[PDB]
Amino acid sequence: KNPKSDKFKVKRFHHIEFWCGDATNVARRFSWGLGMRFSAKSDLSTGNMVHASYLLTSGDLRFLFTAPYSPSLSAGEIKPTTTASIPSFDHGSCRSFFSSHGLGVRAVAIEVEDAESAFSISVANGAIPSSPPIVLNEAVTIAEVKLYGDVVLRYVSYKAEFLPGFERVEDASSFPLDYGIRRLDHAVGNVPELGPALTYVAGFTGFHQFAEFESGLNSAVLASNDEMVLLPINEPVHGTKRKSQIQTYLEHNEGAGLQHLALMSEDIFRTLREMRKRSSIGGFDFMPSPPPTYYQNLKKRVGDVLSDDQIKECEELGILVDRDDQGTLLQIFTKPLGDRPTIFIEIIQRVGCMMYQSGGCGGFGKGNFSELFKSIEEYEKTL
Amino acid sequence: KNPKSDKFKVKRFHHIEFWCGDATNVARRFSWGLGMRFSAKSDLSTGNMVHASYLLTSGDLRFLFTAPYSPSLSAGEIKPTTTASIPSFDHGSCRSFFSSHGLGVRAVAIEVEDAESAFSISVANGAIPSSPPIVLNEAVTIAEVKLYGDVVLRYVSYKAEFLPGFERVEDASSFPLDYGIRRLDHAVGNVPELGPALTYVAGFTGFHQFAEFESGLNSAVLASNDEMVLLPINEPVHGTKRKSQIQTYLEHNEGAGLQHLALMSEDIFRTLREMRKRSSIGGFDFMPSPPPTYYQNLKKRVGDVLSDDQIKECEELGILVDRDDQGTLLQIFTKPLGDRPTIFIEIIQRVGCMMYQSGGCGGFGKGNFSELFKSIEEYEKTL
Numbered sequence: 206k207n208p209k210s211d212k213f214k215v216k217r218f219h220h221i222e223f224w225c226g227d228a229t230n231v232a233r234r235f236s237w238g239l240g241m242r243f244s245a246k247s248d249l250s251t252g253n254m255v256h257a258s259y260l261l262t263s264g265d266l267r268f269l270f271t272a273p274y275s276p277s278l279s280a281g282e283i284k285p286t287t288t289a290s291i292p293s294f295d296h297g298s299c300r301s302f303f304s305s306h307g308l309g310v311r312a313v314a315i316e317v318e319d320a321e322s323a324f325s326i327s328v329a330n331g332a333i334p335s336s337p338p339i340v341l342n343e344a345v346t347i348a349e350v351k352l353y354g355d356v357v358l359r360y361v362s363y364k365a366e367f368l369p370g371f372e373r374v375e376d377a378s379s380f381p382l383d384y385g386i387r388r389l390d391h392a393v394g395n396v397p398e399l400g401p402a403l404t405y406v407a408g409f410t411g412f413h414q415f416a417e418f419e420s421g422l423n424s425a426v427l428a429s430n431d432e433m434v435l436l437p438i439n440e441p442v443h444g445t446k447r448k449s450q451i452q453t454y455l456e457h458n459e460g461a462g463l464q465h466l467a468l469m470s471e472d473i474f475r476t477l478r479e480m481r482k483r484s485s486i487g488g489f490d491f492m493p494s495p496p497p498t499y500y501q502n503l504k505k506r507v508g509d510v511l512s513d514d515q516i517k518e519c520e521e522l523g524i525l526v527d528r529d530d531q532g533t534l535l536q537i538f539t540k541p542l543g544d545r546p547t548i549f550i551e552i553i554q555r556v557g558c559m560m561y562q563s564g565g566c567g568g569f570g571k572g573n574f575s576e577l578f579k580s581i582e583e584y585e586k587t588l
Numbered sequence: 589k590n591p592k593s594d595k596f597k598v599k600r601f602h603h604i605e606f607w608c609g610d611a612t613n614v615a616r617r618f619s620w621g622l623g624m625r626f627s628a629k630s631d632l633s634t635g636n637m638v639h640a641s642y643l644l645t646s647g648d649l650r651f652l653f654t655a656p657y658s659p660s661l662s663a664g665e666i667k668p669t670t671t672a673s674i675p676s677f678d679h680g681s682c683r684s685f686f687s688s689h690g691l692g693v694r695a696v697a698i699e700v701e702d703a704e705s706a707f708s709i710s711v712a713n714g715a716i717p718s719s720p721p722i723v724l725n726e727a728v729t730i731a732e733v734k735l736y737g738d739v740v741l742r743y744v745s746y747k748a749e750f751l752p753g754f755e756r757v758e759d760a761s762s763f764p765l766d767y768g769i770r771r772l773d774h775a776v777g778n779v780p781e782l783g784p785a786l787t788y789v790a791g792f793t794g795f796h797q798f799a800e801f802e803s804g805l806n807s808a809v810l811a812s813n814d815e816m817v818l819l820p821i822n823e824p825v826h827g828t829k830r831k832s833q834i835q836t837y838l839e840h841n842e843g844a845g846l847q848h849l850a851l852m853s854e855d856i857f858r859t860l861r862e863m864r865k866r867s868s869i870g871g872f873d874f875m876p877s878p879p880p881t882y883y884q885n886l887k888k889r890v891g892d893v894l895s896d897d898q899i900k901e902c903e904e905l906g907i908l909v910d911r912d913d914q915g916t917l918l919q920i921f922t923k924p925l926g927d928r929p930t931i932f933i934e935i936i937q938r939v940g941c942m943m944y945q946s947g948g949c950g951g952f953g954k955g956n957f958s959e960l961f962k963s964i965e966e967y968e969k970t971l
C-alpha cells in the first residue's frame with residue numbers, strides 16, 4: 206500500500222553532485238565511461254573564482270562534478286559578493302569531505318515545487334539544516350538538509366539552463382556521446398544503523414516504505430508519492446562468515462555515505478556493450494559475471510519474459526535478472542568508481558508495470574543474492 | 589660548451605609522480621588521453637593500506653599516480669612496519685600538497701648510479717633533504733631532495749619491475765594503447781626568482797647551463813653531463829602589457845611548482861592525430877592553432893627540413909616548428925591537465941643532431957614566441 210504521505214510536493218530526481226579533488230579529470234573519465242555529454246560549466250572561464258563545476262548529461266540524468274580552487278582567489282569575497290554559482294559550496298567543507306571520504310556523492314538533488322517550502326517543512330519535521338534556501342537570479346531556489354553521513358538532500362525548484370551562473374558548453378567540447386542511459390532510478394545509502402536513519406528521513410520527508418529485506422545487510426526503501434524518487438538505505442549485518450560489504454564500505458568511507466547510483470538505461474544491452482568496450486581504455490569495470498549455471502537457471506525463472514536469444518545476450522554481457530510479482534529487472538554492477546571500495550554504479554532496465562511505467566517495477570534485485578549463491582554452488586559442483 | 593660537472597652519475601629520467609585526490613580517475617583519464625598502458629599497481633589489492641599508486645607507461649615514459657587512503661586503514665602501522673610501497677609517502681604531506689596546489693607533479697625522478705651517494709653528495713652541496721635513502725627489498729634505493737616549491741627531485745638506483753611492492757597489471761586491465769610517446773624530454777618549473785632557483789639546483793647537482801633567454805618570462809635550462817636530463821626553470825617578467833602567464837601560474841598554484849612536461853614522440857603526427865581524436869571524449873585539449881600565415885612562414889624557415897606536404901601535416905595538426913643552428917623542433921602544447929591553469933603537457937619530436945640523437949636538439953621553441961606574434965599580426969592584417 207501507498208499512503209502518499211509526502212509532506213511537500215516532490216517531482217523527480219534532478220542531479221547528483223560529486224565532490225572531487227580535480228573535477229576536470231573525474232568528469233572527463235565519467236563522460237567517456239558512461240557516455241554522458243558535457244552540457245554546462247561554472248568555473249574560472251565563467252567568472253567563478255570559488256569552485257570548478259562541470260555538468261554531464263545523458264537524457265534526464267545529470268551528474269555534476271565540483272572541486273575547490275585555491276581560497277586565495279576568492280579571499281576578498283563575502284557571501285553577499287560571492288562568485289560561486291552554488292551558494293552552499295564551502296572550501297573547507299569540500300576539502301574535509303574529500304579528505305575523509307575520498308571521491309563520492311555530496312548531494313542527492315530532487316526537484317520540488319518550492320524549495321523554500323520543502324526546506325521549511327523538512328526542518329519543522331526534524332531535518333538537520335545544511336544550507337538555507339537561496340534564490341538564484343530570481344529564477345531558481347536551492348536548499349539543503351542532511352540526508353546521512355556528509356551527504357545532503359538538495360531541493361531545487363524552478364520558477365519557469367541548469368543553474369544561473371552556469372554556461373552551456375562550447376559545441377566543440379560537447380561531443381554527443383550517448384550509450385543509452387536516461388535517468389537516475391534510485392540512490393542508495395549505507396549507514397551504521399538502519400532504524401534511526403529510516404525514522405529520520407521518513408520523518409522529515411513523509412516518504413513511505415516501498416520495500417525491505419542472510420548475506421551481509423538489512424535494507425529498506427523510502428519512496429515519494431508516485432514512487433519515482435527511491436532512496437534505499439542499508440545497514441551491515443554483523444555475525445556472518447564473509448565480512449559484510451556494508452561494514453567494509455563504512456570502514457573505507459569513514460562512515461555513512463552514498464553506496465551506489467542506479468542508472469536506468471533505455472537499452473541495457475547497448476549500454477553494456479558500449480561500457481564494456483571502454484572498461485580498459487579509461488571507462489568502468491564490471492563485477493565478475495555469474496557462472497553459466499546462472500543463465501541456465503534464467504530460463505526457468507524468466508523464460509516467459511525473455512527469449513532464449515535475449516537470455517544469451519544477458520549472458521554475453523554479464524547482466525543479472527530478477528523478478529517481482531509485477532515486473533522484471535535487468536541489472537549489473539560496476540567495480541568501485543574510484544580508489545576506495547566505496548561508491549559504485551548499477552545499470553538497470555525494468556520490464557512491466559505499464560499503466561508510463563510505475564516506479565520500482567521489478568524491485569531492486571534482492572532475489573539475486575540467493576540466485577547468485579545457488580548458481581555459484583552449482584557451477585563448482587559441475588567442477 | 590659542456591663542462592660535464594655532474595657531482596654524481598646521472599642516467600636518465602625515470603618517472604614522474606602526480607599527487608592526486610583520486611588516483612584511479614586521473615590515471616584512467618591520462619591513459620586514454622595520452623595512449624599509455626596500465627603497467628603496475630600498488631594498492632589495497634597488493635596489501636598497501638597507505639596509498640593507491642598506479643603506473644602508466646608508454647615506451648620509456650613512466651607516469652605514476654598516487655593518492656592517500658583513509659589514515660585509519662594504517663593507523664597501527666609505524667615506518668618500520670609500513671605497508672606503503674613508497675616509503676617517502678605521507679598522508680598529511682599528500683593532502684596538504686593537493687589542497688594547496690591541486691593536481692600536479694610531486695616528484696621528478698631520475699635514475700642514478702647510487703641513490704644513497706647521490707643523496708649524500710646533493711645534501712653536502714646544499715640540497716634540502718626531503719626523504720633519506722631507503723633500500724627496498726635489498727634491490728632498489730630511493731631518496732628525495734627538494735627541487736622547487738613542493739616538488740622533489742627523486743633519485744632511484746637499481747642493483748641489477750618498477751619498484752618492489754608493485755605488481756604487474758592483469759593483462760585484461762592492461763589494454764596496449766600506444767599513440768607514439770616514448771620518453772620524457774624535459775620537465776619545466778615555474779619559480780618566483782630564477783637566479784636563486786638556478787644557483788640552488790645547479791649547486792647540488794653540478795648540472796650546467798644548457799640554454800637560456802620580451803613576452804612574459806625569463807628562462808634557463810640546467811642539464812646533466814650527456815644533456816639527457818633537462819630541467820628548464822622560468823620566472824615571471826613583471827611590467828608588461830599582457831599579464832605574465834608565469835605569474836598566473838604562481839597565483840593559481842599557490843607558488844612555485846612544475847609547469848609542464850615535454851613528452852618525446854617517435855611520430856608526432858600520429859601522436860597528435862590520436863590525441864586530437866580523443867580531446868572531446870575524455871582526452872586532452874590543445875591550445876588554439878596558429879593562423880595560416882604561421883604555416884606559410886614555415887616554408888621560408890624550415891623548407892629544407894620539411895617538405896610542403898609535411899608542413900601541411902603540421903598545419904592540419906596545429907604543430908609548431910622551431911629551429912636551432914643544429915636541429916629542428918616540432919612541438920605543441922595542451923590546455924591545462926586539470927581544473928587550475930597550472931600544469932600542462934608539451935608533445936615534441938626533434939630532428940637532427942645525429943651522432944643516437946644529442947639531447948635538446950633544436951632547443952625549446954623560444955623562437956616561436958616571436959614567430960607566433962608575427963604570424964598573428966600578419967593574419968589580422970590580412971583581415
Ligand SMILES: Cc1c(C(=O)C2=C(O)CCCC2=O)ccc2c1c(=O)n(CC(=O)Oc1ccc3ccc4cccc5ccc1c3c45)c(=O)n2C
Binds near residue numbers: 492574
Ligand atoms: C548492490 C546490489 C543490489 C542493490 O542494488 C540493492 C539495492 O538497490 C537496494 C536493496 C539492497 C541492495 O542490495 C542488488 C543486488 C546485488 C547487488 C550487488 O552489489 N551485487 C554484487 C556484490 O555483492 O558485490 C560484491 C562486492 C564486494 C565483494 C567483496 C568480496 C566478495 C567475495 C565473494 C563474492 C563477492 C560477491 C560480490 C561482492 C563481493 C564479493 C549483487 O550480486 N547483487 C545481486
Ligand SMILES: Cc1c(C(=O)C2=C(O)CCCC2=O)ccc2c1c(=O)n(CC(=O)Oc1ccc3ccc4cccc5ccc1c3c45)c(=O)n2C
Binds near residue numbers: 774820822833956
Ligand atoms: C611552454 C612553451 C615553450 C617551452 O616549452 C619552454 C620551455 O620548455 C623552456 C624554455 C621556456 C619555455 O617557454 C616554448 C614555446 C611556447 C610555449 C607555450 O606555452 N606556448 C603557448 C602559450 O603561450 O600558451 C598560453 C598560455 C596562456 C595564455 C593566456 C592568455 C593568452 C592571451 C593571448 C595569447 C595567448 C597565447 C598563449 C597563451 C596564453 C595567451 C607557445 O606558444 N610557445 C611558443
Ligand SMILES: [Co+2]
Binds near residue numbers: 393465569
Ligand atoms: Co540497486
Ligand SMILES: [Co+2]
Binds near residue numbers: 774776848934
Ligand atoms: Co618545453
